[PDB]
Ligand SMILES: O=C(O)Cc1c[nH]c2ccccc12
Ligand SMILES: c1ccc2[nH]ccc2c1
């Protein structure tokens with residue numbers, strides 16, 4: 404199965420599989436049941452920004468999600484990604500809806516990994532119809548209003564259900580290297596989760612996985628496009 408690490412922006416509490424019973428951000432290590440989470444207020448319809456930070460030195464994966472009004476949620480988790488990820492990965496974004504749904508619009512995404520140096524840095528503030536440096540998967544499409552919609556949206560402006568989608572950066576990343584003194588990465592992305600459903604679902608993740616990683620099957624709704632199941 405795909406080796407996955409992820410920061411999840413989890414708009415839907417699936418508390419029969421580990422979610423806390425609020426909207427939450429989570430660090431996911433090889434499982435969809437977050438090693439760590441934090442209560443997150445998903446502000447409907449607002450543009451949000453997620454920052455994920457990790458370095459090999461402090462070995463603490465962190466993520467803040469916040470919105471323009473100042474609310475903000477943080478999560479950190481002490482872990483050595485040298486022991487969970489393969490040397491070469493892909494990075495990307497993943498989203499899903501299920502029974503409930505939302506827009507999973509990504510408005511920008513930037514990523515930096517370094518190995519001190521080797522370094523890879525990319526930034527998308529405007530995505531194209533034909534984004535040739537993004538591998539799109541499942542429902543994800545880009546363009547031409549400069550957005551990445553990771554989950555199937557519908558003409559009048561509408562989040563459908565039972566949708567998954569991800570975009571990985573095309574180039575694989577060398578995310579660690581054992582002689583590296585420092586192997587760090589940060590990623591940032593801004594998103595617009597909107598819903599008029601009774602509850603939005605299910606969320607946006609930033610993820611690193613093996614380079615060949617795909618959408619496991621039946622991974623919509625609560626498995627966020629990251630896992631074959633909820634183990
Ligand atoms: O793409 C975005 O909207 C985030 C963006 C990446 N580089 C930046 C530098 C300064 C301010 C915003 C951004
Ligand atoms: C509560 C907890 C987990 C879940 N997975 C799908 C529906 C659902 C509800």
Ligand SMILES: [Ca+2]
Nearest residue numbers: 413415416417
């Ligand atoms: Ca969930």
Ligand SMILES: [Mn+2]
Nearest residue numbers: 413422429437
């Ligand atoms: Mn969760």
